[PDB]
């Protein structure tokens, strides 16, 4: 019984690892989009200075 539980729990751990990898990749995408947005804000700030 302990071997059965250990095997299924290791499988669950592998699934959890895959889920965190997905979440971290998509959070990285969110961070990159935020960073591009900030750079755009910078350029608009330069435009405002010109005005």
């Amino acid at each position: 019984t302990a071997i059965e539980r250990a095997d299924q729990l290791a499988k669950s751990a592998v699934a959890q690892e895959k889920a965190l990898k997905r979440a971290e990749e998509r959070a990285q995408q969110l961070r990159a989009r935020l960073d591009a947005m900030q750079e755009a804000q910078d350029q608009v700030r330069r435009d405002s200075a010109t005005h």
Binding site: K11, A15, R22, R26
Partner: protein, 51 residues
């Protein structure tokens, strides 16, 4: 319409997140259920032989 676009795009993005997560657990649940089905059959054979 711009505001409605923003809110719909956001909540659709959340829906895509949820569907990806649910698809991953579709896979894990179905695979584990198939493994336990194999275990059911093998214990069927074992108990038949022993009895």
């Amino acid at each position: 319409i711009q505001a409605e676009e923003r809110e719909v795009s956001a909540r659709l993005a959340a829906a895509e997140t949820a569907l990806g997560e649910s698809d991953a657990r579709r896979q894990t649940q179905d695979a584990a259920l198939e493994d336990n089905a194999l275990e059911i059959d093998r214990l069927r054979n074992a108990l038949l032989q022993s009895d």
